[PDB]
Nucleic acid binder design. Structure first.
Ligand SMILES: Nc1ncnc2c1ncn2[C@@H]1O[C@H](CSCC[C@H](N)C(=O)O)[C@@H](O)[C@H]1O
Ligand SMILES: Nc1ncnc2c1ncn2[C@@H]1O[C@H](CSCC[C@H](N)C(=O)O)[C@@H](O)[C@H]1O
Lengths: 285, 188, 285, 174
DNA sequence: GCATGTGTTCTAATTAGAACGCATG
DNA sequence: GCATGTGTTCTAATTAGAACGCATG
């Protein structure tokens, strides 16, 4: 070619647009950011925090190949399908082929549709994220359909919380070790507001369940304030996840609704690490 | 890859059959010599891409859900998704000389939502092939004569009933392979 | 010429520390800011947003004459006592002499205790706020105890909301005409998040009643958003009041708790208009 | 020893202060709502400022009398440096509930003295900067009996006028 | 081993919305 | 004028908290 060009992204199960946030933070110029999402709160956050840059296309099952060919070409295809039927924290999980588990195959389908034709040299990148705490059979099958073995990355190395996640993909240097950057907050204390004391160095995996913010078998409170026990505030969960403060403070959402969004999202510094070497392949305003 | 070719230049079909074997059907129709071309695999869970390529070039990829009964060990959608996966594995390079066909057959095990998924992944609506209502099957394929012919219309209400009688528990149904005769060698 | 010194403030019924926020906005140095407050949500907002500058001393009825003289001398005494038993929006208001209405006299008491003795000509400013929509005799009696008549200032002329309030006090130029500034958001459209359309120019008085955010007897929705109508968000209410965005996003408070705080609070640009002449009397940043 | 100038609020005490032998030198104001500072000032200096709630079962909130008393009391104080003797006394006939009593003590910056009449019969509470009211060790009486006295009074003054008694040193008699 | 977990479903506690009120500028 | 209001209360929907869960690294 001649010069770098703005990146074109297909984001499946976009959530609160973590991908676009990270692309923006790395200075990468974005041509188009197409997002498949069905949750109203998620769509609102993405619409507001990114000023309508995101082209929303609704349910992933409504995305036809004709749509992919028309909206494309895409340089980057990213996503993390629901795990509420895949994660072993749900006793009533229905597995990969039932419930919301089969939504994974929608990603496999669209990735297949998005891939350049035979003889097309142009750079093409994809990333799929899901949990470690899933059945060995579901992990196997995901690997088979994606024709790749995942890389396990825990956000504890680069943030203030345990978050062991699998990442399938072809991003340059997915396998390299995570180095802490200057900006990362590695301890819970760095994430607290003024006058609050951390009782733990790192918190554990934050789910959509309210009390996932409590620690251990004993369900201890995470922080001290005025010599009294307290849970994490929303702004603090956002710092722990790596989001800007008050990122989820939209649409009069309650603590539950906010934690619901955060609990499903990616750890920002982890995505920053994975996306980092893409700025070499694309324009950088 | 649609155009018909002169009789002498046609080759014996190489067949990949998954879940159910169709050797008897294709042999009776004369797609394979009675002297033993058809690879049959029951469990595709560990089947990778290199395996399929190793299994040699294919001209026809066949998939079918198990018939009504306890024969459904896997979830009904498992057969479809796996079929799609291995089908993509066995597609010829884009400038491919020979005809390449594929087929997925449902014996009414697939519910409404799963039928919707099947049509979404194979990018086409099924064809209801009724043989009588004695028997009937839903068929996905890139074979023209199958999507073209207008068979007798059948009702989902009538078909949910056949499913019930068959859950309680032929020739024309085997004519899904008929329109393939002109593309490959015929033994008789 | 003796140099100007930082201001020393006693704030009664501080609420969410609007007073301190305005003083710091004007660039006025503050040596001590002693606040009386009871609501834990209020105190928390104050502690966090001002990084623990405010000395909280609890219930106003526990503040003694001796405490005022020991913590003083004060340059500025401000306050706005509860109006839930004053405002005529309450058909079950108990009046100025019962309920929370009598808390007014606590301000009257402490104000008298904070005044310089005879022969002391040092500058001493004070401000008391309450609603226009109160009983006639109650307004009179308040005027009688403070020995002053109030200036009426509606926030409508300096912000995007109606809010007719009474202000008693001796601040330099309280009567003077109001003026628009660069950062005065006069229109509701300027207070909304991206992608949201304002149906009206101004909104009516916001209270602790959630549906006070709707307009008219027909209770119209104030905003349009993506094929549906909507109310104001917490952030947008904050902008309407002139607070910094996400000012009240603390301690997992719901929409209702946040509007409860804002519903009682001052209109920030109004307080800035009233506090502005104090820049001449005290040290600046 | 000059005579005495008295400001009387709500209740007239001309009949009690005549036996005392103490524009006229007594200003009596019934309701003090529109009474501003200049009005109190114009009524000449004062040596004694009296105020008291109406008898049990007589139109206004009980706290009103206390707040208004405080306001006019502040209006009527002398210069900071003390030219002579200034005296004030607020009297309650047990109208004030527990809340009102603590408000009374907070604003008048002192605890009340309980005045009993027995040989409970009639009782009175007194806030006063008079050093004589305070140090007299009156016969102890509690609230529980005072309450019962109030409850038995709603179904339907002497030594309180001797609460005036120790003011005789200050002014001319007869 | 053994603590862990992108969840779901129970409660009692709050939230979000709507009815009520009428004196005051 | 007449229509607006630093509130309180009551109902159904959500919240915030807790129990329940067992295969997995
Ligand atoms: N049928 C569907 N089509 C598109 N999105 C769906 C969907 N069903 C669920 N989703 C969305 O898929 C998301 C999976 S959680 C992943 C969120 C995202 N990775 C982030 O970082 O924010 C959820 O937000 C859910 O709302
Ligand atoms: N007894 C008391 N002592 C101190 N504060 C009290 C009190 N009773 C009520 N309050 C507080 O008085 C406040 C009156 S609303 C005034 C809020 C403030 N002017 C602002 O700008 O936000 C309320 O916050 C209430 O919690």
């Amino acid at each position: 070619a001649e010069k770098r060009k703005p990146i074109r992204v297909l984001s499946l199960f976009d959530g609160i647009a973590t991908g676009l946030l990270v692309l923006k933070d790395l200075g990468i110029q974005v041509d188009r950011y197409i997002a498949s999402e069905v949750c109203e709160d998620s769509i609102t956050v993405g619409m507001v925090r990114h000023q309508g840059k995101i082209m929303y296309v609704g349910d992933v099952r409504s995305v036809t190949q004709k749509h992919i060919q028309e909206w494309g070409p895409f340089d980057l295809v990213i996503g993390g399908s629901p795990c509420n039927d895949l994660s072993i924290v749900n006793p009533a999980r229905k597995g990969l082929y039932e419930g919301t588990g089969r939504l994974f195959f929608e990603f496999y389908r669209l990735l297949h549709d998005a891939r350049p034709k035979e003889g097309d040299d142009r750079p093409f990148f994809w990333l799929f994220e899901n949990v470690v705490a899933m059945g060995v059979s579901d992990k196997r099958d995901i690997s088979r359909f994606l024709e790749s073995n995942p890389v396990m990355i825990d956000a504890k190395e680069v943030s203030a919380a345990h978050r062991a996640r699998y990442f399938w993909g072809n991003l340059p240097g997915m396998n390299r070790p995570l180095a802490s950057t200057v900006n990362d907050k590695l301890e819970l204390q760095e994430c607290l507001e003024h006058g609050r004391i951390a009782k733990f160095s790192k918190v554990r995996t934050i789910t959509t369940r309210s009390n996932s913010i409590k620690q251990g078998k004993d369900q201890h409170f995470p922080v001290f304030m005025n010599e009294k026990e307290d849970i994490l505030w929303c702004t603090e969960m956002e710092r722990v996840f790596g989001f800007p403060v008050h990122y989820t403070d939209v649409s009069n959402m309650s603590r539950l609704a906010r934690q619901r969004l955060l609990g499903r999202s990616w750890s920002v510094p982890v995505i920053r690490h994975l996306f980092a070497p893409l700025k070499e392949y694309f324009a950088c305003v | 890859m649609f155009e018909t070719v002169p009789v002498w230049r046609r080759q014996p079909v190489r067949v990949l059959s998954l879940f159910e074997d169709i050797k008897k059907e294709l042999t009776s129709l004369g797609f394979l010599e009675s002297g033993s071309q058809l690879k049959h695999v029951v469990d595709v869970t560990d089947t990778v891409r290199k395996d399929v390529e190793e299994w040699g070039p294919f001209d026809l990829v066949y998939g079918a859900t198990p018939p009504l009964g306890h024969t459904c060990d896997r979830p009904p959608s498992w057969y479809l998704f796996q079929f799609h996966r291995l089908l993509q594995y066995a597609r010829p390079k884009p400038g491919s000389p020979r005809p390449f066909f594929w087929m997925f057959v449902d014996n009414l095990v697939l519910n409404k939502e799963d039928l919707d998924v099947a049509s979404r992944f194979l990018e086409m609506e099924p064809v209801t092939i009724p043989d009588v209502l004695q028997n009937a099957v839903r068929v996905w394929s890139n074979i023209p004569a199958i999507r073209s012919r207008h068979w007798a219309l059948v009702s989902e209400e009538e078909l949910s009933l056949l499913a019930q009688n068959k859950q309680s528990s032929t020739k024309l149904v085997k004519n899904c392979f008929l329109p393939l005769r002109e593309y490959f060698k015929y033994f008789s």
